[PDB]
Design a protein around this nucleic acid. Structure first.
Ligand SMILES: COC(=O)CNc1c(C(=O)NCc2ccc(F)cc2F)c(=O)n(O)c2ncccc12
Ligand SMILES: COC(=O)CNc1c(C(=O)NCc2ccc(F)cc2F)c(=O)n(O)c2ncccc12
Ligand SMILES: [Mg+2]
Ligand SMILES: [Mg+2]
Ligand SMILES: [Mg+2]
Ligand SMILES: [Mg+2]
Ligand SMILES: [Mg+2]
Ligand SMILES: [Mg+2]
Ligand SMILES: [Zn+2]
Ligand SMILES: [Zn+2]
Lengths: 182, 367, 367, 182
DNA sequence: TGCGAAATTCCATGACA
DNA sequence: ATTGTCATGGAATTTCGCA
DNA sequence: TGCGAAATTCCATGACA
DNA sequence: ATTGTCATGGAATTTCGCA
């Protein structure tokens, strides 16, 4: 069997609804299966239109062989199927109520949800501007299993923004009180 | 008078050849030369004669001498002519140069992706979806290109586009020309906040951004082909063109920009599959060797009449937007430092230090 | 299918080398080549493959083949690639040429004064006394120049100025570019009434009027020098500049235009007096010898990759004012006649006969 | 003594007042002494201003060493003297009431006055447009003494407009009747 | 060990306002 | 304180298929 | 019959929208 | 049915003044 490679499989899912931030309510999460590299796209709805518009930006940089998702309506629509077929992308769905991906992708999506929560508190309506620095942090995070960051596995070089100081990724006692109030 | 007096009586004076007869006639010292009888004016009148002859049409060396030679002769006439040409401010700033610039440098390709971005604007284009310009961002090492449509070549549009681009990676250096969008203090603050060093071309020298300029040509060439026989709706074609150029082979490199950036093709037509049996680590190992073995051009031969700058030399900067019937060159200035054979710092005609390309300089004639 | 069928069983087919093994896998004919295993598509599918690969970014020969070579192999692939490049209308009319024009002609200097006038307009200049343009008239043989200020580059202003000029003499031929003032039927009637033949440059080729264009440079260069540090009041300087240039020596000729026209200087500064003892008849005899012994340049060496037109060749005319994102070249046309190595008649893209310069043509690539 | 040459001496005089032709009333006649070449300039007055304006056109083509004229006020003014001095032109005047030039110039000025009269009749207000063809005729007229036209002596070549058919230069019987009526 | 032809490499030309 | 670049297609050169 | 220097010739460079 | 041109100043070459 062939070794796993970047662009073999993109895992996608929606996070939201979030507090409004410059008119956007959701985040489309795209994670490359082999590298763990993450792309985040803000959308106004978890719809096929918003998905196609965001993935058209990504697929103008690189096209995956397979896109994996759950049975969400945006992903199982006939329009999204035609979109993937026009680009030679095979769609792969997990069983309803049984989300299945990979350990690396599971943990990566866990980190994304936790990192967003830690930065939502105190400024819940300013996450649109923070999406760039969030991806840089995620994609320059050391992987214990592969012993390389997603940036290193995708580009084959070191980064100009190495993130050495890891956020606690656990809400401090004061951050928990402000989140319960919100 | 005194020098010409001893010449009339037969005494020898250096510069005046002895085999000729110097006589007086009509109150003027004359000499019978092969071309005819010429008047020998006293030393105190020769500067005015050279000036009167030159000022007829502000002629160069030979065309001025031919006028003077019609009536006068004296030792080393062209020496006095060149002495006036070097002092005529009108000629120095209006005349063209006849000395070409030294041969171009071929600066090293950046070693890694994201080491140096080159950015520039294209436009104004025909209005498409309300957009008129395209921000172009080319990675120096790979040639991988990002395209962003904008309504203006503004700092705000640049920052918005680069905030999206820098979601993937932060570059060490951004190189750009001195257009208004890239020189504003707002853009400088944006780069300093992200640890990005801003590098600027010398003024009025698009060669220095040649990496992106050359990409601009390919972008517009493909847009033109795709828009043949259709209205110029280019907004929806930018993502197509971006993907198409990023996966186009360079015949001299034998690789696409996408391959130089990722080391493997994505799910695009005619994807290369040579590293299908390698692991990602072996793939990245081959990619590192490919990045270091790329062909690099060398400096071409200098033309037969080129000039290279020297510290202390008098040079003149080209006027940027010369008005009608106005000189094309500034007053002479001095080369303070030679950064490289094609780039110098001059003491500007306003008194400031100015870093310019020698393509926008000429050496002041007649020293 | 039929050709590939006999290849699978071991029979030899011309073009397919024998030392390779041709097998079947996944319902596709394949071959193990040094670069890897490649698919051999049937003949009936190769044109579509070349078209799909080329259409990704409308690439040239090598960049298109490198795409196809990633997946397929078949005999003489580049032959099929070049066959598609020559049929892609979008590439033929958008791509640049890489073949330079043949070397320039140096047409004979007119034998006599008033044999051929070259005329052209300069402007618009800054408004001076209500005037914006200058009609320039240069005699081909002598270079003697007449300057007329006008308010517009119009036929009426040309006729008024030339009626004054022709008070001194009538020229055989007037050469001009195809500007509106010189192509109007009114101007044609004006010349026919006086027995003057009108000669026109090929379109969009100011080289052909190079005699006057070069004089235009000297005119504006001297005006610029005289107007340094003053407002651009050039109207009163035209008579000064005219006289100054007409009595300026050409260093390679050793004569002024005034001398080539009259054979003797008038009462201008630094007048030559060499023929003071000759009679007018002896003076005119020397003038006739001078006019015939003037230096004439020769055709320069052709560049290493130049092209020369041939009857029946497919060529493409440059688009005059190409819009944004529009092709720079017209559709291919045929060379009807070769007037000289730098001038041809083509069957225009509108169906007409058009006399053009090869500087505004490129040879259609891929035959 | 030096042989005579073009530009050695220009002979000038005014002809007029003539019938109005596009606002002009006089003709300034300039004749080169050696060649007999003629320049004609229409003016509105026999004044220094009109003389300087016309001769500035001519002296932008060629400058004479000497200008000869009678004691007319336009030519003897201090302004015209300064104009000639600025250009290095020596002014030479004939004795009052004793006009003196040369046989060639005398006969040339005779031809000009007669040729203008022959073309004035029938169209006395249209001579401004005919000044070019008049000069061409005069300057391409064969000289019995020198056996060359002014055009030939000035440029050293033949002309493209050789005038072989000479006007009678004598008014026909019908032209005399129309001139007496006018 | 050499031939004819295909394949690859070379590189002048021109355009990025 | 900064610096030209590279797709293009005929031509020149090298390699290939075969003996 | 030759030397050093002045004078002449050569010619690449660039601009005429 | 038409076609590049030539001022410019360092450099290369020739000529000059003298012996
Ligand atoms: C010589 O033209 C100039 O002085 C500068 N013109 C620009 C040019 C320009 O003239 N480009 C043409 C060009 C000419 C020669 C080259 F080697 C590259 C070029 F892109 C440009 O491309 N960009 O992007 C600019 N951006 C901002 C301000 C000016 C320019
Ligand atoms: C290449 O530019 C053109 O297509 C033509 N432009 C003109 C030009 C023009 O571009 N002149 C510039 C120029 C470029 C190259 C040359 F070899 C000579 C020139 F004068 C022009 O001088 N005149 O007088 C024109 N008169 C009427 C219409 C056009 C022009
Ligand atoms: Mg989902
Ligand atoms: Mg720019
Ligand atoms: Mg640019
Ligand atoms: Mg013109
Ligand atoms: Mg012109
Ligand atoms: Mg009088
Ligand atoms: Zn000057
Ligand atoms: Zn094409």
């Amino acid at each position: 069997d062939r070794p796993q490679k970047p662009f073999d499989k993109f895992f996608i899912d929606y996070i939201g609804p979030l507090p409004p931030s410059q008119g956007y309510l959701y985040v489309l999460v795209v994670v490359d299966g082999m590298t763990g590299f993450t792309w985040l796209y803000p959308t106004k709805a978890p719809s096929t239109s918003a998905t196609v518009k965001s993935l058209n930006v990504l697929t103008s940089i690189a096209i995956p062989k397979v896109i994996h998702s759950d049975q969400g309506a945006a992903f199982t629509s006939s329009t999204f199927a035609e979109w993937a077929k026009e680009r030679g992308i095979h769609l792969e769905f997990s069983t309803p109520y049984h989300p299945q991906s990979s350990g690396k992708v599971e943990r990566k999506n866990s980190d994304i949800k936790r990192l967003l929560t830690k930065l939502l508190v105190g400024r819940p309506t300013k996450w649109y501007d923070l999406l760039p620095v969030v991806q840089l942090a995620l994609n320059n995070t050391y992987s214990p299993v592969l012993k390389y960051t997603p940036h290193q596995l995708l580009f084959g070089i070191d980064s100009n923004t190495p993130f050495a100081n890891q956020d606690t990724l656990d809400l401090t006692r004061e951050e928990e009180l402000s989140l319960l109030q919100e | 008078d005194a020098e010409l007096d001893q010449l009339l009586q037969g005494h020898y004076i250096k510069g005046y050849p002895k085999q000729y007869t110097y006589f007086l006639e009509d109150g003027k010292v004359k000499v019978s030369r092969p071309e005819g009888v010429k008047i020998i004016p006293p030393q105190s009148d020769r500067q005015k004669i050279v000036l009167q002859a030159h000022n007829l049409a502000h002629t160069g060396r030979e065309a001025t001498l031919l006028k003077i030679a019609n009536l006068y002769w004296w030792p080393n006439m062209r020496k006095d002519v060149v002495k006036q040409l070097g002092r005529c401010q009108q000629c120095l700033i209006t005349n063209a140069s006849n000395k070409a610039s030294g041969p171009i440098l071929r600066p090293d390709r950046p070693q890694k992706p994201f080491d140096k971005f080159f950015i520039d604007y294209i436009g104004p284009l025909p209005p498409s979806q309300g957009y008129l310009y395209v921000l172009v961002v080319v990675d120096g090492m790979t040639g991988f290109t990002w395209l962003y449509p904008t309504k203006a070549p503004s700092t705000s549009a640049t920052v918005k586009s680069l905030n999206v681009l820098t979601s993937i990676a932060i570059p060490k250096v951004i190189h750009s020309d001195q257009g208004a969008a890239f020189t504003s203090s707002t853009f400088a603050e944006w780069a300093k906040e992200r640890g990005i060093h801003l590098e600027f071309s010398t003024p009025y020298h698009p060669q220095s951004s040649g990496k992106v300029e050359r990409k601009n040509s390919d972008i517009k060439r493909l847009l033109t082909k795709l828009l043949v026989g259709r209205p110029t709706k280019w907004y929806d074609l930018l993502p197509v063109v971006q993907l198409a150029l990023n996966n186009t082979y360079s015949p001299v490199l034998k690789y696409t920009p996408h391959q130089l950036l990722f080391g493997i093709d994505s799910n695009t037509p005619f994807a290369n599959q040579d590293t299908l049996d390698l692991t990602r680590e072996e793939e990245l190992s081959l990619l590192q060797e490919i990045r270091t073995s790329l062909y690099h051009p060398s400096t071409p031969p200098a033309s037969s009449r080129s000039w290279s700058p020297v510290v202390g030399q008098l040079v003149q900067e080209r006027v940027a937007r010369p008005a009608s019937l106005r000189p094309r060159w500034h007053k002479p200035s001095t080369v303070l430092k030679v950064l490289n054979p094609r780039t110098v710092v001059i003491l500007d005609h306003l008194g400031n230090n100015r870093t310019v390309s020698i393509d926008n300089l000429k050496p002041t004639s007649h020293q």
